[PDB]
């Protein structure tokens, strides 16, 4: 009864006779030892998705029921290890003796099981932490053209979580084995592997594994949240996850819709991204943040899969391929990038200075595009055109260089209040390094007060302590 | 009367019954099974009958996940459609698509249960009231006035501001009328739904409000029937109690896509862009029930997601025929920092007639739409030739259109986290007086930057003083 | 036997076994009492389209053939009332005591049964009656984007038929019950219900009723034509009627074509619109004119249903979303709109003045492509620009404001002969009303002569009488 016989095999899909008592979504075992999911239950046959190399499967082979819904191992044992989408090890460091297993498909927490998000997840990047705040429980999308730094923002985030009790998961979907190895070595060089789990389904792995990968990584992150701990998850590219589902759906002969993707494609990503949440105090107060990544062809942010994920997340960080070749980093387009959780998750000292900056850096784009020349505009327009240039310089920041929140507050207070208006634009970057080293070397009382109080009480000391640096042979 | 599961294909399940004991269309069926051994899983599931196929077989749509189902499982017929509680006991409660409570508050114990499918009011029961609902939002109150008892639709792509605009309307209208309120949240975010529930529970407004949700993560059966559960609860206050009510729906596009996902599995031929052949009929089954009659009134604010920013898509296209007012949100305005980002040239309402609004209101709105269209017709000429080559009249028209497009911007109370400003409410008199004063050229010697993010005209003038 | 039984039930479609002697298009009755049309005849089954609530029909139910074609009541008794697609009353004013019934499907009048259309159907709209004329037996299409003024032209046209022997039939297809009720109160407010019949298939009604609606409205219009009277028939939107047919055809499994529609869709609208005609004197001289409406998605006139109906009609009126927001209120594209019957439809007085207007506008359209610069354009080019701007202004008209043909003639005459050229562009609209009040209030003989003779030839007085107004106002 719990045994069937294969009737047809193809490019990762099979059909079998028998398996009468099989249940929708159950794991099934082939005589070769490979496994598959029972998706469709018909009058006389079962449709199976194979989770490995199918070239060893033939018609007439005996298939068997496992008696279990698709599940993955979870626990403390996965920290500092590399595994595939099925949770099996690929680092060569031996077996995993995990004590608990969890289904990869689960409903998200309800409206009452949640609570508002208020504790800031610092990224270390001045444009994100000021203009596009992130908090524990939020879902922020990283979007831009190929070769623009999307993986660098995710890896810089998984490293700034050094002196915090946050557990990081990185899910590689459709990536090259060489890029997976470069990410793992970068994490070991910075020590992030002491608190990280890596899940991989590379470009050469079957599309069925590239489909299960984000769900398996989510189940591992939920374990920490369900026990009151904090976790973070990265999805290296949801654009490749969608292509893998389009392949499986077209091979099952489901009718296509927009851009040949299946009608089910919204439910695919929305069922995964709504499991990221901050739970209520009765549930334990735990959290799970998400950082999905997407790739735009020629900057077409308006495409189906990109706008579809933007409609699910709590904010967007858009990266420009045009600004990147103009010597600008992180190259975030503030005129399009925004967050729905923003302002509330950020600390009070930062709310007091960053509040009006995004809308100012949006109208700045219009003015520089509209102003035909520099000699015909009036004094009222010249004054606001210059401010945006200086703020744009302050927002520039190199790779592998996290800046702490207390230092970000002092420099943004200087720019948003006009202290940089006499300094030339080419000297603004020298000012930022010289000013931060001056305050840390002889006024640690400003940075220490912001670190303990999280708010600006009296600015009088900072105005005078700042003016002293200006009088003392500034740039 | 019982039957058995014959097939399972994602959200769709086929069931076979006994000789002549077949259930009617839209009828609810129940699956209650306890695991007999360790290889099975416990299941509690509701199915809705969609069509008759022959061989004593019926095709159905599942309301929750079909994971764990096995061919041969026993199914029971309830004898009627999905039935939900109705009455004053439902006020201040949160509900699931099946009318079961989400909140930890206990059983509702209402006196009657109504079926989710009911015929709409006939032509002789319709109303023809022409009363202006003041919102306090400077762009809607001028260019697209909201009729009492009519439908107002918010159209926009991803992240343009539909939810921020709905929540500012909820705050401003539900404050002074003190009538019964309903919010459906068909595609509403669980995080936003939680932020809404906490504010309403602390402000006391929850005691007059019904909530139904039906989250993004749910299967299509729930995303398809949830808009009808909230509407069936709002209909009771109109029909049996004679009251005036507000019905909010954050997403009716999700209701259309849930029908599209279902259609291929039912065995139907697809139409344009892969949609179901029944799209206009299904939208009319929902929209014809949302009307004011001689017994009472239903006023509704709805948000419509526009996929890939294309308004020609079958779902947004089918919806425009049903609305009394239509607001379209533009990315070009949002990317430029102008919020709420409502497009002045595509937004309109039934009420914008010389017979329903004052001569001064009609003339100011006419002059605003015209100056913005003239400015839209010149951005090519200003790109090819220098601005010093345009005539004095066109030069003034550009400066006035520039001031007007940003004087249409306003800081909302529900947006203090994003705007960094307190929040403002503007009365109709100050909106009309404001635009007239700019159109007539009294404010030509004032910078464009002074008109951005100010509620009223007197504020723009002190904002100019705050800058030498 | 003549008894069939149901074997499948879906969204308004059912399939049955038996019914061996049923004929194509016959009405069939279900055991629940509801009715349906036998559209597809197969080797072993009949595809039935349901004309009511389908939720009461189940597999194994008995279905019987009626032996009758679909028919609707007709006569004078339908005037000033509102009915559904089957002719049943919905205004709440009681039963209808019509003495005759006519099938909704009948053949159009032949080539030899017709005569050329030579008499006008006044719309009261200066852009249509001067530049896009309508005769009393012509089919004219109203086409443009949503919210551009499509129903307003049809309703203003129905309101202008008060002092004329024309029965008006307004057919609402896929409209909201609330907009139907709002239009009916507007027709009563202006008194148009003293000669108007309203037929309505609401958006809530099954696709089969929205399919039958134009044919029923056409059958009611034909009764008046067959008895020597004049009739006008409006179809509020043929686009929703095509969508309703696409739904039934896809659910019945007929093979799709262009833009997902069935290949049969040209024959759907051509079998309808060719029934509008002016009969010969041997047949009685009666007439039926049609005003179908179509909605375009984002200005795409090249789409399937739009190009299909553009090829069937005798002329088209194009409405632009661009002109509408720019302050040209009726919003008609006069340089693109056309009627073949133009000239023959108009009266001798209107034609004469229409001609000069046509040349002036054509020249202005040629010049406006490069009108961007005007301080550099030659003074001669300016004469062409100035005249064209002023003729455009005369065409602007408020909703529900039909101008009588003698007044349209009197004002177009003034603009074309240069008498409105000297008036400032903004002041032209004011001057128009003031001049018409002056001509009617004192020396009304000009307006009386044009109504009787319909040919002018008396201009010396019109010129001298006009100079007395322009002397100080
Ligand atoms: N000549 C006019 N002058 C002023 N306003 C007008 C004029 N004609 C129409 N309008 C206004 O235009 C709006 C839309 O008119 P109407 O409903 O007839 O357009 P429509 O194209 O048929 O719209 P829909 O596609 O929704 O049916 C109404 O507010 C109407 O009052
Ligand atoms: N009125 C507004 N004022 C300021 N910011 C706004 C406003 N409307 C939209 N935004 C910004 O844009 C986003 C709008 O989110 P939301 O309303 O949910 O978008 P949508 O529902 O259209 O997808 C938020 O991140 C918010 O910061
Ligand atoms: Mg929203
Ligand atoms: Mg209309």
Q: Is B429 on the interface with A (CB under 8 A)?
A: no
CB A412 within 8 A of CB A357: yes
Q: Does B67 touch chain A (CB under 8 A)?
A: yes
Give contacts of A357 with chain B, Cβ < 8 Å. Answer: 420
Query: What Cα–Cα distance (Å) separates residue C273 from each residue in A217, C217, C234, C268, C270?
Result: 63, 12, 11, 9, 5
- Quick one: angle between helices A265-273 and A207-226, nearest 10? 30
Q: How far is CA B29 from the centre of its chain?
A: 30
d(CA B70, CA B66): 9
Instruction: Say which residues have a Cβ less than 8 Å from residue C39's Cβ, sequence separation at least 6.
Output: C24, C25, C47, C48, C49, C248, C252
Helix axis angle, C265-273 to C304-312, nearest 10°:
30
Count the alpha carbons within 13 Å of C345 in the hemisphere toward its beta carbon: 28
Cα–Cα distance, B23 to B26 (Å, whole number): 9
A235 and A241 Cβ atoms separated by less than 8 Å: yes
Q: Do chains C and A touch (3 or more CB pairs under 8 A)?
A: no
Report how far residue A268's alpha carbon sits from residue A266's, in angstroms, rounded to the nearest whole number: 5
Longest Cα–Cα distance of chain C, Å, equals 89
Distance (Å) from the alpha carbon of C43 to chain B's nearest alpha carbon: 17
Residues 6+ apart with CB under 8 A from B468: none
- Partner residue facing C59 (CB), from B52, B128, B374: B52
Nearest to B415 by CA among B159, B136, B172, B165: B165
Contacts of C347 (CB under 8 A, 6+ apart): C120, C405, C454, C455
Q: Is A134 left (phi over 0), alpha (psi -120 to 50) or beta?
A: beta
CA distance C16 to C70: 20
Distance of CA C302 to the CA centre of its chain: 21
C-beta of residue C317 within 8 angstroms of C-beta of residue C151: no
**B335 interface with C at CB cutoff 8 Å:** no
The tokens for B425 are 């409410």
Question: Scanning every residue of chain B, which has its alpha carbon at the shortest distance from the alpha carbon of C185?
Answer: B128
Ligand 1 cavity residues, CB under 6 Å = B 352-353; C 146-152, 295, 329-330, 397-399
User: Please, what is the end-to-end C-alpha distance for chain A in angstroms?
Assistant: 83
Instruction: Name the 3-class secondary structure at C2.
Output: coil
Residue in chain B closest to A110 (alpha carbons) equals B190
B280/C176 Cβ within 8 A: no
d(CA C272, CA C241): 12
Run of H or E residues at B142: helix B140-143
Residues 6+ apart with CB under 8 A from A106: A219, A222, A275
The Cα–Cα gap between A272 and A290 comes to 10
**Which residue shows structure tokens 């249903």?**
C305
Tokens of A201: 């389904």
The helix (H) or strand (E) run that includes residue A30 is: strand A26-30
CA C280 to centroid of chain Cα atoms: 23
Task: Single out the residue of A23, A51, A53 nearest to residue A39, CA to CA.
Answer: A23
B274–A112: do the CB atoms touch at under 8 Å?
Answer: no
The CA–CA distances, whole Å, from C373 to C370, C385, C387 equal 7, 11, 17
Q: Which residues, other chains included, contact C292 with Cβ-Cβ below 8 Å and sequence gap of 6+?
A: C139, C141, C142, C234, C235, C238, C269, C273, C309, C313
- Kindly report whether the peptide bond that precedes residue C311 is cis, defined as omega within 30 degrees of 0: no
CB atoms within 10 A of CB C267: 10
- Whole-angstrom Cα distance, residue A227 to residue A229? 6
Longest Cα separation, chain A: 88
| C393: its two tokens | 């202004």
**What is the DSSP-derived secondary structure letter of residue A44?**
S
**What secondary structure letter does DSSP report for A280?**
-
Whole-angstrom Cα Rg for chain B: 26
Please, what is the end-to-end C-alpha distance for chain B in angstroms?
A: 84
Instruction: Report d(CA A128, CA A149) in Å as an integer.
Output: 14
User: Which distant-in-sequence residues (6+ apart) come within 8 Å of A67 by Cβ?
Assistant: A2, A26, B38, B39
| Distance, CA of C1 to CA of A352 (rounded, Å) | 86
Contact A415, A390 (CB under 8 A): yes
- Cα–Cα distances (Å) from C325 to B49, B245, B373, C351, in that order, read 48, 34, 7, 30
3-state SS, A119-174, equals CECCCCCHHHHHHCCCECCCECEEEECCCCCHHHHHHHHHHHCCCCCEEEEEEEEC
Residues of C noted as catalytic: 340
Closest listed residue to residue C140, CA positions, set C352, C407, C319:
C319
Helix axes C428-441, C445-453, angle to 10 degrees: 90
Q: What method was applied to determine this entry?
A: cryo-EM
Cβ-defined contacts of B453-461 (< 8 Å, 24+) = B453/A359, B453/B409, B453/B410, B453/B411, B453/B419, B453/B421, B454/B407, B454/B410, B454/B424, B455/B138, B455/B410, B455/B411, B455/B424, B455/B425, B455/B426, B456/B424, B456/B426, B456/B430, B457/B407, B457/B430, B457/B433, B460/B407
Where b means 16+ CB within 10 Å and e means fewer, C77-107 reads ebebbbbbbbbeebeeeeeeebeeebebeee
What DSSP string describes B174-242?
TTTS--EEEE--TT--HHHHHHHHHHHHHHSGGGGEEE----TTS-HHHHHHHHHHHHHHHHHHHHTT-
Q: Among A306, A313, A340, A361, which residue has the most ligand 2 atoms within 8 Å of its CB, making it the best to mutate?
A: A340
Q: Within the 208-237 window of chain B, which residues sit less than 8 Å (CB to CB) from chain C?
A: none
Q: How far, in whole angstroms, is CA C159 from its chain's centroid?
A: 13
Alpha-carbon span A8 to B100, nearest angstrom: 44
Instruction: Establish whether A340 is a catalytic residue.
Output: yes
Residues 6+ apart with CB under 8 A from C438: C469, C473
Distance of alpha carbon A317 from its chain centroid, rounded?
A: 10
> How does strand A26-30 pair with strand A62-69?
antiparallel
DSSP secondary-structure letter at C423?
S
* Residue (of C444, C429, C440, C438) closest to C468 by Cα position: C438
Token reading at A193: 């592997």
- DSSP single-letter state for residue B122: P
Q: What is the pairing mode between strands C196-202 and C287-295?
A: unpaired
| Beta pairing partners, A141 | A316
Give the largest Cα separation in chain B, rounded: 89
Residues 6 or more apart whose Cβ sits within 8 Å of residue A407: A436, A439, A440, A447
Q: How many CB pairs under 8 A join A and B?
A: 174
From the list A20, A23, A271, which residue is nearest B69 (CB)? Answer: A23
Closest by alpha carbon to B117, among B238, B222, B26, B30?
A: B26
Strands (E), C105-238: 141-144, 166-175, 196-202, 230-235
C-alpha pair distances (Å), A437 with each of A58, A393, A443, C116? 69, 18, 10, 95
User: Regarding beta strands B297-305 and B151-156, do their DSSP bridges make them parallel or antiparallel, or are they unpaired?
Assistant: parallel
- Residue A338, classed as helix, strand or coil, is strand
Q: If we measure between CA atoms, which residue out of B69, B81, B80 comes closest to residue B5?
A: B69
Residues of A whose CB is below 8 A from B53: none
Q: What are phi and psi of C29, to 5 degrees?
A: -110, 125
Determine the Cα–Cα distance for residues B97 and B453; give it in Å rounded to an integer: 40
Distance CA C225, CA B164 (A): 58
Task: Write down the H helix ranges in C48-174.
Answer: 126-131, 150-160
B158 touches chain C (CB under 8 A): no
Distance set, CA C443 to CA C407, C438, C465 (Å): 14, 9, 8
CA A239 from chain centre, in angstroms, equals 13
Question: What burial class does residue A178 get, using C-beta atoms within 10 Å of its C-beta: 0-12 exposed, 13-18 middle, 19+ buried?
Answer: exposed
The answer to whether residues A412 and A354 touch, using CB atoms and an 8 Å cutoff, is yes
Sort B67 into a burial class: Cβ within 10 Å, 0-12 / 13-18 / 19+: middle
CB A154 within 8 A of CB A327: no
Residue B265: C-alpha distances to residues A39, A263, B12, B68, B383 (Å): 14, 11, 7, 19, 52
Indicate the pairing of strand B74-81 with strand B83-86: unpaired
Q: Nearest to residue A268, comparing CAs of B8, B46, B261, B60?
A: B261
3-state class (DSSP) for residue C325: helix
CA distance C232 to C122: 11
Residues A109 and A333: beta-carbon distance below 8 Å: no
Q: How close are the terminal C-alpha atoms of chain C, in Å? A: 85
Contact (CB, 8 A) for C239 and C295 = yes
* CA A359/CA A367 separation, integer angstroms: 13
Please return the burial class of C59, using the count of CB atoms within 10 Å of its CB with bins 0-12, 13-18 and 19+. buried
CA angle, corner B267, sides to B262 and B269, nearest 5? 95
HSE-up of residue B268 (Cα within 13 Å, Cβ side): 28
Interface test with B, best of A66, A137, A143, A263 (most B CBs within 10 A): A263
Is B54–C8 a contact, with Cβ atoms under 8 angstroms apart?
A: yes
**Do A257 and A19 contact (CB within 8 A), yes or no?**
no
Strand order in the sheet with C196-202: C82-83, C196-202, C166-175, C230-235, C287-295, C141-144, C315-319, C338-339
């Amino acid at each position: 009864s719990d045994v069937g016989t294969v009737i047809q095999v193809g490019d990762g899909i099979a059909r079998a006779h028998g398996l009468d008592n099989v249940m929708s979504g159950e794991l099934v075992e082939f005589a070769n030892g490979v496994m598959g999911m029972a998706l469709n239950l018909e009058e006389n046959n079962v449709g199976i998705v194979i989770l490995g190399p199918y070239t060893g499967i033939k018609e007439g082979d005996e298939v068997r029921r496992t008696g279990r819904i698709m599940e993955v191992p979870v626990g403390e044992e996965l920290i500092g290890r590399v595994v595939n989408a099925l949770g099996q090890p690929i680092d060569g460091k031996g077996p995993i003796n995990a004590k608990e297993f969890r289904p990869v498909e689960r409903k998200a927490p309800g409206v009452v099981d949640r609570q508002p998000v208020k504790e800031p997840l610092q990224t270390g990047i001045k444009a994100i932490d000021a203009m596009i705040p992130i908090g524990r429980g939020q879902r922020e999308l990283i979007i831009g053209d190929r070769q623009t730094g999307k993986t660098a923002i995710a890896i810089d985030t998984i490293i700034n979580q050094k002196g915090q009790d946050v557990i990081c998961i990185y899910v590689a979907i459709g990536q090259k084995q060489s890029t997976v190895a470069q990410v793992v070595k970068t994490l070991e060089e910075h020590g992030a592997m002491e608190y990280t789990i890596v899940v991989a389904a590379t470009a050469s792995d079957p599309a069925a594994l590239q489909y299960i990968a984000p769900y398996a990584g989510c189940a591992m992150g939920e374990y920490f949240r369900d026990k009151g701990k904090h976790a973070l998850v990265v999805y290296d590219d949801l654009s490749k996850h969608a292509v893998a589902y389009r392949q499986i759906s077209l091979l099952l002969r489901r009718p296509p819709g927009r851009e040949a993707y299946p009608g089910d494609v919204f439910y695919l990503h929305s069922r995964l991204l709504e499991r990221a949440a901050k739970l209520s105090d009765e549930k334990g107060g735990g959290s799970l943040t998400a950082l999905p990544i997407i790739e735009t062809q020629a900057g077409d942010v308006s495409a189906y899969i990109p706008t579809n994920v933007i409609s699910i997340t709590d904010g967007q960080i858009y990266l420009e391929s045009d600004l990147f070749y103009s010597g600008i980093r992180p190259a975030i387009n503030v005129g399009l990038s925004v967050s729905r959780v923003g302002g509330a998750a950020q600390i009070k000292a930062m709310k007091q200075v960053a509040g009006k900056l995004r809308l100012d850096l949006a109208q700045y784009r219009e003015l520089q595009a509209f102003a035909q020349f520099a000699s015909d505009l009036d004094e009222a327009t010249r004054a606001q055109l210059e401010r945006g240039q200086r703020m744009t310089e302050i927002l520039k920041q190199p790779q592998y260089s996290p800046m702490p929140v207390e230092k970000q507050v002092v420099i943004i207070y200087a720019g948003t209040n006009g202290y940089l208006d006499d300094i030339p634009v080419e000297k603004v970057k020298e000012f930022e390094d010289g000013f931060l080293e001056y305050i840390e070397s002889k006024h640690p009382d400003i940075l220490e007060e912001i670190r303990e109080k999280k708010a600006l009480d009296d600015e009088l000391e900072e105005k005078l302590k700042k003016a002293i640096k200006e009088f003392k042979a500034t740039f | 009367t019982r039957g058995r599961v014959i097939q399972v294909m994602g959200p769709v399940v086929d069931v076979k019954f006994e000789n002549g004991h077949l259930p009617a269309i839209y009828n609810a069926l129940k699956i209650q099974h306890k695991a007999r051994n360790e290889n099975e899983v416990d299941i509690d599931l509701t199915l809705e009958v969609a069509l008759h196929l022959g061989d004593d077989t019926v095709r159905t749509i599942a309301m929750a996940s079909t994971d764990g189902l096995i061919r041969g499982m026993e199914v029971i017929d309830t004898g009627a459609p999905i039935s939900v509680p109705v009455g004053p006991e439902t006020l201040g409660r949160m509900f699931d698509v099946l009318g079961e409570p989400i909140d930890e508050k206990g059983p509702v114990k209402a006196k009657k249960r109504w079926p989710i499918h009911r015929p709409p009011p006939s032509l002789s029961e319709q109303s023809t009231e022409d009363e202006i609902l003041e919102t306090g939002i400077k762009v809607i109150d001028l260019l697209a006035p909201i009729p009492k008892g009519g439908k107002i639709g918010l159209f926009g792509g991803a992240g343009v501001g539909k939810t921020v605009l709905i929540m500012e309307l909820i705050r401003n209208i539900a404050y002074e009328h003190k009538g019964f309120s309903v919010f459906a949240g068909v595609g509403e975010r669980s995080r936003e739904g939680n932020e809404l529930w906490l504010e309403m529970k602390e402000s006391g407004v929850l005691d007059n409000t019904v909530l139904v949700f039906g989250q993004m993560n749910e299967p299509p059966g729930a995303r398809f029937r949830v808009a009808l559960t909230g509407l069936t609860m709002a209909e009771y206050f109109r029909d049996e109690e004679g009251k005036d009510v507000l019905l909010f729906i954050d997403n009716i596009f999700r209701f259309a896509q849930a029908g599209s996902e279902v259609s291929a599995l039912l065995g139907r031929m697809p139409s344009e862009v892969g949609y179901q052949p029944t799209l206009a009929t299904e939208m009319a089954e929902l929209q014809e029930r949302i009307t004011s009659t001689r017994r009472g009134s239903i006023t509704s604010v709805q948000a419509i997601y526009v996929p890939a920013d294309d308004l020609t898509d079958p779902a947004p296209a089918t919806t425009f025929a049903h609305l009394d007012a239509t607001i379209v949100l533009s990315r070009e305005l949002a990317e430029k920092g102008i919020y709420p980002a409502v497009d002045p040239l595509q937004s309109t309402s039934r009420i914008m007639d010389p017979r329903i609004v004052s001569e001064e209101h009609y003339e100011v709105a006419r002059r605003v739409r015209e100056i913005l269209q003239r400015y839209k017709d010149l951005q090519d000429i200003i790109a090819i030739l220098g601005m010093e080559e345009l005539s004095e009249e066109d030069k003034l028209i550009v400066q006035r259109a520039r001031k007007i497009q940003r004087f249409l911007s306003q800081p909302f109370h529900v947006a203090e986290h994003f705007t960094g400003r307190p929040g403002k409410y503007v009365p109709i008199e100050d909106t009309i007086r404001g635009f007239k004063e700019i159109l007539d050229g009294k404010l030509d010697d004032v910078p464009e930057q002074a008109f951005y993010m100010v509620g009223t005209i007197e504020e723009a003038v002190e904002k100019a003083k705050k800058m030498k």
